[PDB]
């Protein structure tokens, strides 16, 4: 469809087992689901230092949808990581970018079961802005108003203020979700949940001593 030629369906990737197990981080997957159901400031932007698992929270949200562990208002939603690169690519003509983004947003309103995920939401400023063309930020800023566009974002703490914050319009709509760096004890439980992925790729065995050592020595 229109969303597969731009976005990556994370919900379909979670059905096929292509997303890593996101153990822990549950209190913030369900917190993203709280923010998506709010009156205003209903767009959760996952802020956190690079590496703490901001993409993994939404990848853990996709795994929660396919397991039926979400509320019925977010049941069988399709998360799409809309990359701006596939949206700019092509577009060797006029409006090509605004109509490829209008067809994305029309497809979100038509099916109505899409939670858009914009990873690197700071990169929304200046996407497809061509000569005599409006970027992807100016196209959506409006849609956010109508609330016809619940998006999930994921920036760093630096690039949240450096951009998303400033926009005052976005402020009353985007809600910064703190994606904290986990503790060592939380990280060991992440590594235990990720044994079977890294023990199968390398066909090795990873002892419990190694994962406690991996999170402590790191």
């Amino acid at each position: 469809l229109v969303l597969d030629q731009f976005g990556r369906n994370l919900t379909a990737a979670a059905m096929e087992g292509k997303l890593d197990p996101v153990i822990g981080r549950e209190k913030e997957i369900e917190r993203v689901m709280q923010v998506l159901s709010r009156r205003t400031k209903n767009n959760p932007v996952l802020i956190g230092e690079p590496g703490v698992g901001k993409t993994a929270v939404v990848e853990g949200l996709a795994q929660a949808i396919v397991h039926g562990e979400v509320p019925e208002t977010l049941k069988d939603k399709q998360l799409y990581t809309l990359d701006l690169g596939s949206l700019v690519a092509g577009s060797r003509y006029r409006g090509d970018f605004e109509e490829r983004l209008k067809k994305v947003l029309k497809e979100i309103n038509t099916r109505g079961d899409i939670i858009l995920f914009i990873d690197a939401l700071h990169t929304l400023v200046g996407a497809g802005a061509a000569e005599g063309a409006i970027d992807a930020a100016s196209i959506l800023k409006p849609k956010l108003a109508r609330g016809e566009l619940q998006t999930i974002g994921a920036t760093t703490l630096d690039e949240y203020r450096k951009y998303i914050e400033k926009d005052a319009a976005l402020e009353r709509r985007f809600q910064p979700v703190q994606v904290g760096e986990p503790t060592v004890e939380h990280t060991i439980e992440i590594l235990k949940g990720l044994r079977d992925r890294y023990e199968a790729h390398h066909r090795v065995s990873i002892t419990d001593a190694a994962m406690v050592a991996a999170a402590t020595l790191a």
Partner: peptide
């Protein structure tokens, strides 16, 4: 007794020329 007031030079440069994307 004396103090030298140094002088923290700031990095100040002219605005960047941009390269354009063409839409025919």
């Amino acid at each position: 007794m004396k103090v030298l007031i140094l002088a923290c030079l700031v990095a100040l440069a002219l605005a960047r020329e941009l390269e354009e994307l063409n839409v025919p």
